[model samples]
Target chain A: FRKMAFPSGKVEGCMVQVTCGTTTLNGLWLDDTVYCPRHVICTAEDMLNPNYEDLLIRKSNHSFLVQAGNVQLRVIGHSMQNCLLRLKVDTSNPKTPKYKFVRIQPGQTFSVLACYNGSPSGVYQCAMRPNHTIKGSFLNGSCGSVGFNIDYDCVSFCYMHHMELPTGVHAGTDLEGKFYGPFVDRQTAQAAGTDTTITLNVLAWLYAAVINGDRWFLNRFTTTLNDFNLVAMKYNYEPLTQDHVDILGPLSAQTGIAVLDMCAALKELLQNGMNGRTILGSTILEDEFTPFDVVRQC
Target chain B: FRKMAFPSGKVEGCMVQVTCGTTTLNGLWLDDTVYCPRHVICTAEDMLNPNYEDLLIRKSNHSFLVQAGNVQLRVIGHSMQNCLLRLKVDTSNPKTPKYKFVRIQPGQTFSVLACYNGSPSGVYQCAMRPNHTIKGSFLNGSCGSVGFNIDYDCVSFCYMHHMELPTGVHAGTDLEGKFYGPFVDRQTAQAAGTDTTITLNVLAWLYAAVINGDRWFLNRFTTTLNDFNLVAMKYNYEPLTQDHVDILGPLSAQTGIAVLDMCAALKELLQNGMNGRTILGSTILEDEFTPFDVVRQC
Candidate 1:
């Protein structure tokens, strides 16, 4: 993920139209550059534009299937004009999900994800492709766009976390009232066990609530989780905070449903609440919560 | 009561200050240009020089009792510089058991009474002094701050509402989760039949809540009022919608606490809830089965 800081709140933007190898991209509005969706170009203008909404042609997170349901997944990377870059699938999405690094390189195609059934849906990730690592890292950084060659700066692999919550992710979506419940029905789970879809749906509902950042709804969420945890311990389905286990539905275990950075930010917000602050700052919700300290730790 | 039409939800402000003859008067910050205590001003750089917090000058809401209790009363009118002005004490505060408007302008101070008592507390009001009636009703609008003499704008007689509800009205004041209700006990109130301090305090509490505008607290407020209203009615004290009576407490029945304009705006907001739109643009609190129109009719 890119981390571009603006000297001030009032910034024009970053990218405008550019005729890369072949793809001529339209302008990207970099408003609040710190928290924009990394994948889409210009979120403000492009995403909202009826003409540009169809920018990313990816499907909603679908589960992986091996029995003849091998969906052809493609990862298109727009490498900076003259920079050599790398891509890697990061973080704790259980499905213990792993990705084979296959960079077809842009001008060509960034990468691909051809998988089968039984595979994880979205298998949401926090991909930190040491991205601008290979060559011209310094070149691209210093390559001021002022009467300069704009090659190799075509951008690169971006990660998008399409968590179940956050409906109307952009322009359209949809939500509810009170107590989003003890998701995992204890009595039913005792009878049929945790593997059932009923239990799965319960967790699914919670995941959506968490992603949207609805604090009170989130309260109900945490309550139900604790309630579930109590019952699960009795049933022997021990839930772990950072366990990247397959039972977590489409969400990866490491990041829970909010993906890596979002997960940390959410945790930080929750922590803030614990510390007596409910209305959080925009930075907490929108910044890359994956601290440089932790990245260094990794 | 100047009703300057602002197109949207955001607006700047108004000041409640005047000079019977230029005593270099202090001003007041009417929490809301619509509704608030009119106190002496300290907002101008001239007043604060290097400080900012030393703003308003009296108590939350106080009265005037010649000597013993100079009962520090403040009517801070935002003086439109170099503009002539006049003043008046208009409207009504039901809580005002008696205030001899002695403007001698009786078609006028209407039917007022003069008395002395250490009984009632915090009876807020909205005073309508056809303030800038005389001069520059043209000057400021035309003179463009160009030196000129505008007369009779001497200063409008201002009625200062010092209700007990608004504690620290300002750019930022703190409140929530504290004593807001239970102002009237069920037994004592039901026994009073109607005219009593219990009833007065109940109305005072609710009026204050209304002025406070903190939703949750307002919720507590509305809840208490509902309970009291139910109780007040059992004992025979019914609330009048727009009756500008002296008995109700320093408010005319029309706008009651906020007076017509602020009253209408506050009414409009309550109406927003009554209209089926709950989670207000501000906070989620103070609700009722009180139909939208009831809320709106305010």
Candidate 2:
């Protein structure tokens, strides 16, 4: 991959015309050189020209792709260029059973998946089993342009033991977030055979929360992760129940869904007590602990 | 120098506390890793922490310095970090006369001075005798952080022949500008013995115009450079005049001078017809082509 760098920042009021060999390229390509290949030549025209904006290319990541001959790469526009240059792009969607609970013997390593697929974008639930070494090298991978949804439920739900967590990946976030990283490596993994049955219900809630536009989502979700960790410490690997990954369907829908409507869907999910109604073929004799405060305060 | 990359862009809501071995460092350091030495650990605490701002570190260049143990370096805050990493830091002030007119004998090379030292900052008038190769390398030097004041005067005044120009330098500009470059290598140098006597007056006008807050200063100066080149094409190497170098003294004064007051001083200089009033102590009878329109339209 060829790495090219512009004069930095949004080349607003100025336009860059890139020519590779003999081809003139166009599109809202990633402005950061890390996202661009090595051989691209960027020539910017300023307001000094009377007719400048005809080539209205901008610095952005979420838009489209640039094709030059045989090579095609996703665009990443960052004023901060090379901080993530060492990060490799791996946009291949992770296979689901998105949350994998696994055990590793001493002197062994294993890979477990933990990420949620959502509309327009997805959420990579990072630090599932915290303090684990991310496999490979330092800051070695990327989740493409999709972002991390700081959901507390993931810490409780996506538990792993004797495994490493991923870091140094190129990820983006919705609200107040950084493009490259917060680069966090904290929290301990949950114990073995802890029933992660209700993990999906929590993932759905996070999906609903983001779509519901709760600005304080990070704090709110962080509280959940903390609470779950606390409970795990007390209950000695207490198990949550069976399949509810189906709940993520509507919550993660991308069909031009409105924020208010999604909030309603979230409230409905909460009112139903979140997979609390039954266990296998048996009826629940006791009330399932449901955190109604998980509903979006927005 | 150490090349550390942040998550890219200003860590505004985030404060990075760097610990180097035993010493905890402080001060506003360059946000771009290119300006930072290797082995600097940057730990950023975000809005998640209540006592965040007590660290109060920001990404900027015009401010103070950062000291770890024995090393000291000027700060450069660029969201675009590595684009200029190959560019070496060259803050050493150029030896003055500020303007060097020289002839290169066959197979030999020479260096010329072509930047002005003004109050608060200076102007590195680029593209004088355009298309010359910048010696030593490709985009390999920096002018520290002091900016370029794109005055056309340099094109006409600071003439050089058969020489290369400088590129890949870290430079700033006062008005609509990019910190890195426009990266131009156009236009040609004046012939030998072209009288560049009027160059100093043009430099003074540019210096005064920036202080006077003229927004159109770039275009206004470009016209001067273009016109002078046109005249040089017709007449061999008509010299302007000498001794007006002293005029730059009062114009470059830094003592909190008022903008309106400087405007008055500019006009006063314009009314004097530049160096046209005398030719080596011989009084000129012909009208000196003083371009009054060159004054700031502001």
Candidate 3:
């Protein structure tokens, strides 16, 4: 959770790391430090002649848990420096998902997920410990570290809902009678129930029609609806059972033929819907709706 | 039309004074002049002056035989500009529809039909002028103008649809197999007829569903066919139909309920939603489906 900014420069064999400390540590030592003509730190020269740069290591107590399941980690930093970051976890389960190394630059973030399966009791830590090895230990030391404690929990289902209907909540006066309902409290409830039932019935019929190739029923339903200007052109013209045709008789045939025509038109429209240009600007589907406001008399 | 930018200023009884060949026409001459500001004009100024910054006018010529009837004229313009403009027409026929000066803008782009009948078989010129006594007016004679020639065979229908549905002419793709239909070939006249029927059917169904409170069918149909996972949530929790409840069943209901709660929790984390903090952003709606690539695209 702690945000930090680093300077832009290349530090040979220097690792961008995170660490959690048992006790607060002040200045962490870097064995190899060199100053070239271009302010470049060359490991070949630095490792041979080791120097120390007083880099303050403050205590960042912010720590998080990496659950036994998939955990995504990201790093955000400057791109100029060579950042060698590593994440390590301890678990007896060999099938555990391991962390993958990632490099992130300014305005960019990287994510990696780690999965582990073990007893629900043990304490686990994931550390970004940088290894400072300048020419095979000529000068070596740890940069910094950060860690997260892992804990486990189990759940039976991972459910994703496509709709979030507001229940037990009343539509505010602003919406007042705008929404459809019977209005009379009890009657409204009953009406809603009835509407629900009718809707279910319609769906049942549609499903049945789709499955049974009930062209007749579909045709009849479509024709009747079309005659009443009820069915949408998209679904009305769909092929249906003979029963549908029998019901509408002549109109059914007319509608049947019409549906074919409508379908073709719709197809052409859909295929060349955008024509050559991409649809620009916002659409109704992409815009947010009006907020639901409610008022109650105190 | 000539595009002119008007700076914020006052134009009272200032004579717009259009020099028509020889006459420096006086009186409350013609009507309003479009006052388009190049930048964001303040609301207070906009309210006081009441300018039609984005008005467009088109004219055509026609001829009429003298009859005992009145002629009315209708003005068309965008609704975005909250300016009140009127149209006046000379009439001799009293039986014709009375044309009242109407302000047209945005959605209200159509004008009341103007009617006129006179004895003159000669070419009578009809003018569609704006109210010019208010705020912005052309000091020099330079504002958008078009002329109409009244002839014996002049007929005009409001081409309002031009701005409404520009893409209406293009045939969309045939989603027969993809969407639902017995695809028709657009190359043949029979196929074209079939295509038209299918499109009409789709439109009919959409209208029916919207007007008849069968939005659930729409939601399901769109989600199942168009991969629009955002529809169910778009219309709030108002079930598209009772049938939706049955199709979704209890699991979906419970999950949906839970998602609402989760959304409430994350409302603080994000900008808008049920639990979204107003200080952070605006209220959230069901249809705000931002693609996963937005960040990358940005």
Candidate 4:
């Protein structure tokens, strides 16, 4: 009796093969069977066949666990070297994933890399080149190996000056090295060279609009010394002019040729060098002056 | 049937009795019978005369045309000290109009009149009395003697003090006058004794809320000074402690009790006290004492 009280007697049926890399392994069954194609076969009436354990399967191992895409980059407005920022992503599907590059300034901010594998996914693209670099792309395949991350944020630029003084402090004795126009004696006025060339062209157009940044011509030169209280009194005087290139000459050379055409259109859309490398080492000092020493001699 | 065609004929009937302030007359003809007041006699064929023009009656001679009603008066708001304004009119019921007594000042604005037949057509009333006076009423009977036209408008009172410096200069100075304590010679600073007991309790609460009408403790003055740059740097320095009277003694007694309760509610709604004057002046020592050096230093 098949070995008396046997549990389906030492049930047996075998044949097994499963390969990767070389790819091959398809079929196996026993006892009501089709068992072989380098395959599996085990029996006890094929484990008591329930329609041979309902078989209809297809899962041929496929995985790509690559991730990255949560990019955020910023450098908003007001000349970060004539700004331009762009970023894009969509790696044409080779199980996409791969894109990296982050740089920020002027009050910084940054982020990059999405999600993939277990099938959550990722896609990225970023563009804002021209020196402040930020070019990144990825969408399944194509963007092989790319990476970058940088930071530095600090900005605050303010400038202001308001000054006025009319007469006072003069007293002769060769008015200490001549040039003391508004009387202290240029032979006591009477056309002292057309009143010192209309008081040095109104103190060189109010010291080139207060150290050059013309905040509305220094708030209209502090509303003309607060409606004429022009301090410094003593035989009444109101000097401060020096003929800044014959008074704002040719409108400060058309504001320095519109600041060098806005620094050559922000160095052709920020490939770098957008005018600030210290305004090309500035310099312009014309000798002896005083209106409280011409803003510390320029 | 008279004298036919001779271009001359005569027919007469007249009667009138209309007396109110005085006038009367009477007569009649055509078939010559009259008992007036409701007589109907029609010839030329009275087509169903239901009093056809009182049956072309003949009792001619009537006259009565009398008319009246036009009155005026006006006065308005704020004035006091002996005030009166009254008015009344009913000209024997030709139609109502009457008013009287107009005098006003407590924040003044005024107008009054009653005119007719010299056109301002009548019927006027504008009365406002409160400590001051204003009244206007005129109801004359059909253009016969009733005229009164009055006008007076005036309001002027102002107070302002944003003082601290610009009262005499040197509210601050230091070349070591032992850093002038209650100030004697730190160059300048002398309103004296706890700064004249906090500027006479802010001018006795702005003259008891403007010209002694008083509006309660006008912010109860503890010596106010709501930062006009610390009341133009409160005499630059002195001695008032408890941390400058715990921050300028209750903000200068709540800005001198909110400027003496806004000049005692604008001098009690302008009932004229020189339009409730509020010009209490001071800009520190009118440039350094003198009213005999402030009564030879008090």
Candidate 5:
């Protein structure tokens, strides 16, 4: 339920290493022991996903925000070597952005892993593919690890970010293969938004996960999607890191309520990009607890 | 600027007595010391102005969000006799939502006061009235303070909360009075949205200010308006409180993008009570920043 960890790069428990595109954390690791909950020792990437530049394990502009499972990392807290983190806070805004700092001690490792819907213990297995994608096996039609459980015989992610159903005319009806002219927009879907919110932070991480080319971020987000529907209130958290505070800070205040606000801050980026076309050119209709096991899993 | 003060009831310097409609802060007092910047010893009303039930210094939910100058108040901090505070971080996201708990001492009074657009150093002044509206007065046509480099002689708030310039048709022309219908739809404006955000805090305060009928919230909202404009690369902060983080929490994540998103959450409140009629009945168009010095003031 939380994303905070006391150790980032430690020499013990189920630790895993994380690397940005090419760069990596000092020792670049994560402690996997059940330090908190939704434990994940997954390796996240530092790819430059469009829309959010600071959405990396580490961004140097005073810092950025990044999270991998139960471990939330504040890329760089204050300055370098200082990483401010929060457990379970990713989706939970406890009293005062509760932070648990991890001094970047050299040679340490951090770790843990989970499924599209995280569990307090145990790592969910996934079939990894070459070009960096989760394998879509038949069985439950689950995308595996980050697989969707919408009651289907098959599921496939539109890409490495966000667990969403493809929205061409064919998405639910074998109509056109068009993809928003190749793009996006805020819609009335379970995975991304509510009757009102686009479920910003949760999607943000999944978007990042999609970038990780892994299913971790997707796991948390989809769980939010699932949790939101069940009224479980389990995923009701913003789960962010300190770097977001220092760097992107007040900048996201208003839109912090909705992930869509995020796109507005980057108009030029949204425009010239399809990204804009993606945002304004989508044909996805509002769907409810449709199937996820096969029909969903972006 | 920030808004955090300790010792709610005492005799102190720069101490200002804050009251809304009728209620006040603990003991109806605030220490007169500069807690944070934009230090206006602001009179943050713990009182319920009318519109929102959550705008008081204390809400039934055991939490509240208030502000003064740039300093935002989080009603209560760690268990204390009274409380302590921090500064200039009103909009700045801090480490784990860092809190400067004010140890509530017995003898401390909080105070200061403000204007149209706000200033960090001085309390901008205006002719305030008691019946729920500001008293408009003729001046050197000076739209003072952060009032508008627009070079307009006098300015009247569109009364929509944020300081938007009334435009087109009736703008400086003789047109019947009207607002943005506000019944629904997006306006060409910006700032402070929903999600793990100020949707409630920001609005609560603004709503209260409007209830103060003083439009102080409008001043702040207008700042968000301007801060939102300029792409200024300024006002990128997230100074919020535990009460805020606690009360509003991730409930708004999906709606975290625009003020418009918030409109979705208030549908029932907005609908059945635009009164549905309030919104459906009005048919005002964009008017000019009318003669505030000669009209509009309560």
Candidate 6:
């Protein structure tokens, strides 16, 4: 939805500071209030949790400032260079300091903290013990004057990345006590006709997400690649061509695809994409997406 | 070299049938003579030999007919839209049906026959006994009324594909009694700064060759890939992009680099390019280069 606001970092009728990652000149940031260009609100996935519920924001229809403690604001506009903005409330620096940022169901809550990093409003810094991992972390607290949904629950902790059950292999059957599938030969499996394309579609989706500057998806995707030992398959060297950019349209229409499904699809995609033992050992000398820029917060 | 002749299958003043795989409407094939358009003659590599001497033909220059006993005719024009034509003499049928196609230095002459296939003027059908392979099959006989350079010599036969001596492994050292080099891990080699790019350059050259419908290079390249267990790496599913086509410049300017260099470069490039164990097990559903068409006559 197109909306007009004061030319500052402050959202109208609220004290919250909305930090726009990249913005257009039609909007001005002056006196802490932003005179935003007629911009469209964007849908987003949670940075830390892959399976979190949607925020109910339309693709580009409605615009509303998220305020803590039940505050609201509204405005109207119709003409300007269209800007895309995803709004998220930062819950770090609470009115009351040292507040617990995480609460595991009753007893397990104190083992970790989901600290909000101010770099992006939607980011959470997971503070967990060494060798411990978590998935599906969710929010569970009241909105403060400055902090909204500051506390979280650490769900599904200490499992191998995404806990992907391998083909024909039961859980806990491997020597590492991890679930894994049998790695098949690509040519043999291709000759026999296997389901390898779903993974490519999944790749297309995540690739679409990240290419559109979705830091949330990029973090998780890179993490997934790291876990699967498939970083080399990441086409980070060059800007993807138009064909690569347009690949995600068909499958992305089916929403709510699971992160594990992404991992599984990626695993199988790797299986299907694997052609030779020859390792492409060299890194791209000139990369469009550098690790320092895209990987910092994630 | 733009030339005009009678519009028939046969060359002017001669009884040889000229079979063109493809042609433009400016040319015509009629009663025993071809009215060739203002066409540019193209240079070509020897189909059966990678290291044969140059045929002394320009990229687009003088055109002439090969005859059994020194017969020649010429004509000129420069107005019509240019047509590209590669001319080779098909020497399968002889004045004598049982003619020898190959001759060794002294003893190994009668081992193989380089029969000419009628599909293209520049294709050879290799006829050797099982478990025997030959490289560097060059022409050794005269052109007949219907056959030209029908005879050849089986040079460098019995050696494994390209005889690539592996890293630190000398010739005749492997258990199979053939030469091979140690396969390096791509990641480790890249980190250690190995030379892996020359192979990619070599690949670019062959890819350029085959994409431009060079059956000679395609045959030898696919053969090399098959011999190295790298058949899975062939990107046959899609046509080469403009970038892929343009990649053959710069390095290709230095001419006559050896075939063994190609195999060596490919080996290292594979070493540098390999990354994961997950085999991509699916073939492309739609392929621009099918094995049946680009591969059959090779």
Candidate 3 error regions (>4 Å): A1-191, A194-255, A258-298, B1-88, B91-298
Candidates 3 and 6, the one with greater TM-score: 3
Query: Residue A131 error for model 5, in Å?
Result: 27
- The two-chain DockQ for each candidate, comma-separated, is 0.01, 0.01, 0.01, 0.00, 0.01, 0.01
**TM-score of chain B, candidates 1 onward in order:** 0.18, 0.21, 0.17, 0.15, 0.16, 0.17
True contacts kept of each: 0.00, 0.00, 0.00, 0.00, 0.00, 0.00
CA lDDT of every candidate: 0.21, 0.24, 0.19, 0.20, 0.21, 0.23
lDDT digits (tens) for residues B1-298 of candidate 3: 0011111001111112222122221111123221111111222333233233431122111111111213223223322222111112242222222122222211111111111111110111111111101111111111111111111122121111000012112111100111011222122231211111111112222222232222322221112312222332342222233332243233224333322222232222222223322211112221211111111111
lDDT of 2 by residue, A1-298 (tens): 0001111111110112223333332211222222221112223323123121222234334333344224454444323222221112223212111222233211111111211110010011122212222222111121222212112222111111111232221222111122112322122232222222233333434543354333232221222333443453443332222223233334435324432333344333333433422221112111111122122111
User: Candidate 6 on B55-143: residue-level lDDT in tens?
Assistant: 22222222444222333322222122112122333332222222221222110111111111111111111221111222212221101
**Compared with the true structure, what per-residue lDDT tens digits does model 4 show for residues B53-158?**
3432332322121222122211121111111001111122321112222322222222111222222221111212221122221121111112121211111111
Measured with C-alpha atoms, the lDDT of residue B256 in candidate 6 is 41
Candidate 1 lDDT, A1-298, residue by residue in tens: 1111111101112222222122222221222111111222223333233222233233122211101122222222322111111111112122211122123211111111111111110001111112111111111111111100111212232211111112111110000001112211011221111221122222332343344343442321233344444453443333424332234434434325433333333333334433423322112122122222122111
From the highest TM-score down, the ranking of the candidates is 1, 3, 5, 2, 6, 4
TM-score per prediction, in order, is: 0.18, 0.16, 0.17, 0.14, 0.17, 0.16
TM-score of 3: 0.17
RMSD of 3: 31.2
List of chain A TM-scores, every candidate:
0.19, 0.21, 0.16, 0.15, 0.18, 0.17
How well is each residue in A1-298 modelled by candidate 3, as lDDT tens digits?
A: 0011111011111112222222211110122211001001123333233232211112111331222224322222211111111123233223222222222111111110111111110011111111100011000021121111111111111000011112211110000111112221111222112111111112222222222232322222122323322222333322333343343233324324444332233234333442322111111011110000000000
Judged by lDDT, which candidate is best?
2
* Span of 10 residues, lowest total lDDT, candidate 1 chain B: B1-10
Task: Report the C-alpha lDDT of model 5 over A1-298, residue by residue, as the tens digit.
Answer: 1111111111111122233333222111222111111111122231112223133233342322233445654433212111111121123222121123322111111111222222111111122121122212211111111111101111221111122233211111000111212223212341312222122332343233222233211111222223233331222322333333333333234223223332232222212332112221121111111111111111
TM-score-better candidate, 1 vs 4: 1
Worst 10 residues of 3 chain A by lDDT: A289-298
Candidate 5 DockQ score? 0.01
